[PDB]
Amino acid sequence: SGFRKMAFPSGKVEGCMVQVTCGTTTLNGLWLDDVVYCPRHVICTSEDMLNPNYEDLLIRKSNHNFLVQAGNVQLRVIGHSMQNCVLKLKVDTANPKTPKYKFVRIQPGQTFSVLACYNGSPSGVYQCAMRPNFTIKGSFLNGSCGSVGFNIDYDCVSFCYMHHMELPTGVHAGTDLEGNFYGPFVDRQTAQAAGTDTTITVNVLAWLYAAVINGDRWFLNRFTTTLNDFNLVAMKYNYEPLTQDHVDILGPLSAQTGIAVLDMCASLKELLQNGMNGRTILGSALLEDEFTPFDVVRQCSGV
Amino acid sequence: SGFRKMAFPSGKVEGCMVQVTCGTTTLNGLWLDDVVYCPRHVICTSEDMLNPNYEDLLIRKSNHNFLVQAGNVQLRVIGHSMQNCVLKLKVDTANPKTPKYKFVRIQPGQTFSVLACYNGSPSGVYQCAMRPNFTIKGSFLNGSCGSVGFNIDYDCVSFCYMHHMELPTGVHAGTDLEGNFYGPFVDRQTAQAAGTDTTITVNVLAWLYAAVINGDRWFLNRFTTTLNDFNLVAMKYNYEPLTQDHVDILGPLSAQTGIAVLDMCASLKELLQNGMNGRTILGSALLEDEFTPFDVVRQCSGV
Ligand SMILES: *C(=O)[C@H](C[C@@H]1CCNC1=O)NC(=O)[C@H](CC1CCCCC1)NC(=O)c1cc2ccccc2[nH]1
Ligand SMILES: *C(=O)[C@H](C[C@@H]1CCNC1=O)NC(=O)[C@H](CC1CCCCC1)NC(=O)c1cc2ccccc2[nH]1
Numbered sequence: 279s280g281f282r283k284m285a286f287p288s289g290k291v292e293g294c295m296v297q298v299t300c301g302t303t304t305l306n307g308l309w310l311d312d313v314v315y316c317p318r319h320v321i322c323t324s325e326d327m328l329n330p331n332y333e334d335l336l337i338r339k340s341n342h343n344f345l346v347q348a349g350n351v352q353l354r355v356i357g358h359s360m361q362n363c364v365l366k367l368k369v370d371t372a373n374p375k376t377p378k379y380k381f382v383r384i385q386p387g388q389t390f391s392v393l394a395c396y397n398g399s400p401s402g403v404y405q406c407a408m409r410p411n412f413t414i415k416g417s418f419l420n421g422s423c424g425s426v427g428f429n430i431d432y433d434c435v436s437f438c439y440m441h442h443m444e445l446p447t448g449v450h451a452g453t454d455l456e457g458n459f460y461g462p463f464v465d466r467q468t469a470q471a472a473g474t475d476t477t478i479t480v481n482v483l484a485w486l487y488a489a490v491i492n493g494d495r496w497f498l499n500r501f502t503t504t505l506n507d508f509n510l511v512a513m514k515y516n517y518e519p520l521t522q523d524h525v526d527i528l529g530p531l532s533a534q535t536g537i538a539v540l541d542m543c544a545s546l547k548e549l550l551q552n553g554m555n556g557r558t559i560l561g562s563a564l565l566e567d568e569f570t571p572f573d574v575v576r577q578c579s580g581v
Numbered sequence: 582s583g584f585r586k587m588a589f590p591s592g593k594v595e596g597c598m599v600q601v602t603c604g605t606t607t608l609n610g611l612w613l614d615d616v617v618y619c620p621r622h623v624i625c626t627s628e629d630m631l632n633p634n635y636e637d638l639l640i641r642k643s644n645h646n647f648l649v650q651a652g653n654v655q656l657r658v659i660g661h662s663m664q665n666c667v668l669k670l671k672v673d674t675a676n677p678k679t680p681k682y683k684f685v686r687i688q689p690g691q692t693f694s695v696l697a698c699y700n701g702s703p704s705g706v707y708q709c710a711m712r713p714n715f716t717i718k719g720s721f722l723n724g725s726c727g728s729v730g731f732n733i734d735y736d737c738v739s740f741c742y743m744h745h746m747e748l749p750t751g752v753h754a755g756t757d758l759e760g761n762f763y764g765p766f767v768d769r770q771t772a773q774a775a776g777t778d779t780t781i782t783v784n785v786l787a788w789l790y791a792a793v794i795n796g797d798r799w800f801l802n803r804f805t806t807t808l809n810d811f812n813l814v815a816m817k818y819n820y821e822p823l824t825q826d827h828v829d830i831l832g833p834l835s836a837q838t839g840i841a842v843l844d845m846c847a848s849l850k851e852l853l854q855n856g857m858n859g860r861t862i863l864g865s866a867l868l869e870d871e872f873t874p875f876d877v878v879r880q881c882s883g884v
Pocket of ligand 1: 305319324327418419420421422423424442443444445446450464465466469470482582
């Protein structure tokens with residue numbers, strides 16, 4: 279038993295990471311096949327950081343300035359190209375450790391593993407979620423850009439996020455591996471705000487089901503509620519409105535435990551209005567919303 | 582910025598994991614060089630689980646029953662041997678992906694990464710700490726035994742823990758890679774208790790320093806305290822007594838922030854006696870004790 283924040287094994291991604299340098303700037307890139315992907319903001323210098331014209335910055339630039347290193351090994355950049363907010367540096371040697379992979383766009387509420395890298399080398403791996411405001415709550419320092427988020431299905435590595443910047447509130451923003459940013463954000467040194475910090479209700483409910491699977495059941499009430507009565511209260515606590523589709527996703531968890539979805543909703547209604555009272559749930563004193571229904575089932579039953 | 586539970590990259594360990602089967606029982610093993618290490622409890626059958634005599638169980642056993650599989654590949658067991666509570670199955674083919682590694686015994690309070698595996702295949706990676714009661718607070722299901730905990734220093738993988746069992750309170754117990762258990766625990770289906778759940782004060786203090794490095798400073802008081810006054814209060818909250826050696830380990834964190842150790846102690850004294858008040862620190866509503874001083878420095882500054 280037990281339940282913890284669990285990331286996917288980082289081995290398949292570790293061999294795909296490289297250091298990219300374009301003059302003074304140094305960050306990380308993804309070497310899949312003969313291409314190295316990295317944030318286009320590599321080509322920006324102190325002078326042109328507020329409102330950069332990347333087109334113009336590249337019309338001055340050549341694929342001779344960009345330096346890539348796979349370890350103390352160096353690959354040869356042979357042909358660059360900007361795609362949205364990503365750079366695609368064609369290299370001479372194809373990555374021998376390129377895994378079965380696919381690029382996918384995740385939606386708000388979904389979770390992914392992040393491999394934090396600096397200078398091309400891995401620092402660590404952690405579980406993350408795409409917040410409703412399209413930011414992610416991560417741990418990234420300078421030199422972290424280029425680091426990737428991913429999910430692993432069987433043999434396929436599904437790349438979904440590349441780190442680009444930190445917003446003023448300490449949250450982080452980035453793009454998918456095709457160069458399109460998540461949310462309204464953009465790669466310029468403007469002050470872009472995150473918005474309201476909404477809680478993912480379907481995730482909280484799933485983590486409550488994990489609690490019950492793991493023996494924690496003090497929060498369970500004999501009460502029940504309606505979709506609507508719940509949403510009328512949850513909305514003042516900045517909770518994501520629950521829908522009929524979320525109820526269905528919770529279908530399997532409701533039956534494995536015997537606890538109806540609207541029953542948990544009533545139990546959550548009371549934790550929100552009356553609190554936790556210093557009591558703990560799965561070692562947490564707050565309502566965790568970074569577990570998807572599918573994260574619960576995999577950790578509580580199999581690989 | 583940010584601060585999250587971060588594990589070490591799992592790549593170096595993933596290639597060392599194998600499935601071990603001895604009749605009906607199936608678990609995981611570690612294939613380092615030409616040896617495969619696994620818990621000796623592999624040789625136990627329903628009948629002999631309460632008080633097993635492993636010596637006698639082996640005098641009946643042969644290295645022809647034990648089946649190891651590296652993926653859908655099968656290695657050949659050529660010579661077994663029991664070492665403490667571990668089995669050492671000599672195999673014909675040496676692991677080509679065997680990394681620079683060393684076996685080390687960690688002490689209470691120190692942290693390590695766990696790679697949860699089932700049937701030889703990785704499920705996920707998470708950060709753990711050796712609790713004061715010599716148990717670890719993990720997520721392990723049936724078929725998880727053999728999974729390893731580790732720390733990575735530069736190029737060396739330091740293996741420190743192999744999973745063996747779950748105590749009645751949901752906590753987990755295991756040995757080091759030489760076969761010696763952590764704590765008083767033993768490999769038999771007896772009810773062994775964990776003891777008091779002590780909080781690692783030096784770790785909590787370190788996580789408070791992380792909070793201040795990351796902008797959270799509401800808990801900071803203008804008060805100060807003495808070692809002793811602190812320990813006289815912390816002892817009723819089942820906190821590990823702080824010592825002069827812990828104060829020195831906190832030396833670097835105290836200076837990077839400007840906040841003296843006994844100042845944090847006073848700030849912690851008030852959080853323990855007066856509470857958190859629903860306020861959050863680094864997204865947590867409880868006092869986290871799974872970060873060592875050295876975990877703070879690495880995540881907040883470099884690889
Ligand atoms: C890349 O490695 C870093 C990662 C940051 C550093 C702190 N933690 C992180 O997540 N990214 C940056 O430093 C970007 C680089 C810019 C280059 C020009 C185009 C826009 C991105 N900068 C920011 O993340 C940035 C700029 C800025 C301005 C005002 C408030 C916040 C802010 N953040
Ligand atoms: C191995 O894969 C499992 C891992 C456990 C299953 C639940 N979560 C885990 O961490 N280990 C076991 O099932 C052990 C096997 C025994 C074989 C004979 C020698 C002792 C270990 N059993 C236990 O962990 C066990 C037995 C027991 C009896 C009473 C209370 C708790 C308890 N736990």
